[PDB]
Amino acid sequence: QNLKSTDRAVQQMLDKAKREGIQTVWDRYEAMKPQCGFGETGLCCRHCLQGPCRINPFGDEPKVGICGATAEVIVARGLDRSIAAGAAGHSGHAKHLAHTLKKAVQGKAASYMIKDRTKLHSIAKRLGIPTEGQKDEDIALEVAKAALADFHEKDTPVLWVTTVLPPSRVKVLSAHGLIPAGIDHEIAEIMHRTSMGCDADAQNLLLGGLRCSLADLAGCYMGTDLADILFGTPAPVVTESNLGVLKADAVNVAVHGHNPVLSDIIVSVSKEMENEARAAGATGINVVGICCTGNEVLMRHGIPACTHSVSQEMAMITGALDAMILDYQCIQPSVATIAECTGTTVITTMEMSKITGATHVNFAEEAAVENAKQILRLAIDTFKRRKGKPVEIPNIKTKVVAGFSTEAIINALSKLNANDPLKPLIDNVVNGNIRGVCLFAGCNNVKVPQDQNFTTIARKLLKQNVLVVATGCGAGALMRHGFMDPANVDELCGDGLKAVLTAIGEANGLGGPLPPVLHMGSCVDNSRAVALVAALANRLGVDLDRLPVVASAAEAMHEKAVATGTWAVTIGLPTHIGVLPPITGSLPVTQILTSSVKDITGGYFIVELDPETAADKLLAAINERRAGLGLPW
């Protein structure tokens, strides 16, 4: 099973699924092999009904599409559509939160309120919205209308791009025509230009993709901004992760998906229903996280993380998961059929994301508490049914310190230098105690033994004194293998990095270091890492493509991950991807994305499936950036 996942609790559930004859994601993978090489390489097109068109990577015909589309065009068009799909997901989440905030401050949704008024005012100031003498509710209404305006064309560009990146970066992007005009505008323009008989020049197509990737960035940054207003900005928290956070004696309820608009309410209401759950013979309601909605309540409330991404079915295989409460994105639709075998009540809550065989509870912000109780009573009913059934919860969990929003990181640093908080970080970059910064991001992927790339690469970088930050299911991978436990600093970290982590931790009254890896939140919270990196750029007076900062989507899967890797390149970062995107069928596209884009944005992709080699390549990238700054390396 270790060839499937390096997570020992997942291995145990894989053995249980095997002997119970429950098909898993890995079984469905094996049944798909060998996979189609045309699609793997990107040399397939179904953009009109003359297709499917495919092109032989090598050999004889077919060499070209029926309409005359070249391999270069076909590959670029497919990639563009994946970027637009990802942008649509992140920005649909953000749009949902914009409407929730508008409703909250119009008196239409009383379960929701402004919890972070400091963040509200700072966002308003960044956007140019006056706050002087204005009521919070009116400021928030203006912030929500600005969020919504950024979806369409108007007399300004997308402000959740142009107000979050340094002016020098905006200038470079504007010169190349890369600043988005409107989030949904760009998504639709991608779909138009990539339809049959439209754009057919690889460079032109790919510049459109870079622009649409900044619409994805805008959606991420908007989603984080609005979620912090509504639910509070994360601060350091301590909790646990992996399947052993489930409890046989409790009603186990997993929140799974992306949008905390629901999950945050579930957390509160589950507290109120403790007695209504004890009367059923439970000890309480034990809310646990899966995927990014789990990260959201982990960062804000310390809710323990059950599992992530590719291994989500394994939470059900324990037999102890009484409900799985779903919104949208990254939910394997298999959970609906597995639920029959495992006794789990699967519940969907969003109109545009249903699964045949699941129970649907329409959620409306106006009824949030009402809906939460309806959902949690179905969970309690399910716990009652498994009275006296054995369960198999692996007794495996890690300790997790998290909650490192950019504000939290700056506050932590400010204990060392109160009026120039970024300076102690920069000081230790210059003196070599911190070699550079690596963000791990994105998914797991069934093609890669689960977590293997994240942990192999992180170990090499930590030993070389790289400051490692993580989000999404990259944060999930590292947390489940001990990388968010300060007890593991001595083992994992180079002496320079250990010295900094200990200095900061002890100055925040800890008697111990910060954890080896800093958890910066959900996938939309990749925007927090952008906030930190742009704040360092502004303090140093240099653009992001001169900083010793890199990113790794080490086991990417979702179209969202492709969009996010692309905006990391577009804002100036060397960006590793550890699974093959469908680009190898065109050398000219590959050369643009891994080489000549450097001349446009300063970032570039590093496509590398071997994780030891990837770690070497990321270190070289960091160290080239150090050299360009005149720093030893």
Nearer to ligand SF4, 66 or 487 (CB): 66
Binding mask 517-546 for Fe ion (x = CB under 5 A): ------x-----------------------
Q: Which of 1, 23, 27, 48 binds ligand SF4 (CB under 6 A)?
A: 48
> 166-205: which residues touch ligand SF4 (CB under 6 A)?
196
Tokens of 176: 């190349």
36 is in an annotated binding site: yes
Say whether 449 sits in a helix, a strand or coil. coil
| 44 sits near ligand FES (criterion: CB under 6 A) | yes
523 is in an annotated binding site: yes
438 is in an annotated binding site: no
Scan for tokens 């490692």, then name that residue: 468
Q: From 299, 249, 289, 282, select the one nearest 266 (Cα to Cα).
A: 289
330 is in an annotated binding site: yes
155 Cβ contact list (under 8 Å, min separation 6): none
Q: Which of 227, 245, 262, 292 binds Fe ion (CB under 5 A)?
A: 292
212 is in an annotated binding site: no
User: Which stretch, 23-31, 243-251, 289-297, 392-400, contacts Fe ion (CB under 5 A)?
Assistant: 289-297
List the single partner that 38 binds among ligand SF4, Fe ion, ligand FES, none, CB under 5 to 8 Å by kind: ligand FES
Q: From 310, 305, 301, select the one nearest 290 (Cα to Cα).
A: 305
Q: Shortest Cβ distance from residue 346 to ligand SF4 (Å)?
A: 17
45 is in an annotated binding site: yes
> DSSP labels for 132-143?
TT--HHHHHHHH
Binding mask 166-185 for ligand FES (x = CB under 6 A): --------------------
> DSSP labels for 371-394?
HHHHHHHHHHHHHHHTTT------
> 411-450: which residues touch ligand FES (CB under 6 A)?
none
Cα gap 266→326, rounded to integer Å:
11
With contact defined as beta carbons under 8 Å apart, do 24 and 313 qualify?
Answer: yes
Q: What is the size of the binding site for ligand SF4 (CB under 6 A)?
A: 13
| 38 sits near ligand FES (criterion: CB under 6 A) | yes
Binding mask 62-101 for ligand SF4 (x = CB under 6 A): ---xxx-x----x---------------------------
User: Which stretch, 39-47, 293-301, 325-333, 438-446, contacts ligand FES (CB under 6 A)?
Assistant: 39-47
Strands ordered across the beta sheet of 305-307: 359-360, 345-348, 321-326, 251-257, 285-290, 305-307, 237-241, 398-402
Q: Shortest Cβ distance from residue 81 to ligand SF4 (Å)?
A: 12
Helix (H) or strand (E) holding 213: helix 202-231
Say whether 195 sits in a helix, a strand or coil. coil
Scan for tokens 């901004």, then name that residue: 225
List the single partner that 67 binds among ligand FES, Fe ion, ligand SF4, none, CB under 5 to 8 Å by kind: ligand SF4
Question: Both ends of the chain: CA-CA distance in Å?
Answer: 40
How far from the centroid of its chain's Cα atoms is residue 349's Cα? 21
Distances 43 to 60, 192, 256 between C-alpha atoms, Å: 14, 20, 34
Helix (H) or strand (E) holding 454: helix 452-463
292 is in an annotated binding site: yes
Cα gap 582→567, rounded to integer Å:
17
List the single partner that 485 binds among ligand FES, a copy of itself, Fe ion, none, CB under 5 to 8 Å by kind: none
Binding site for ligand FES (CB under 6 A): 36, 38-39, 44, 46, 52, 54
Q: Which residues are annotated as a binding site for [4Fe-4S] cluster?
A: 36, 44-45, 48, 53, 67
Q: Which residues are annotated as a binding site for [Ni-4Fe-5S] cluster?
A: 258, 292, 330, 443, 473, 523
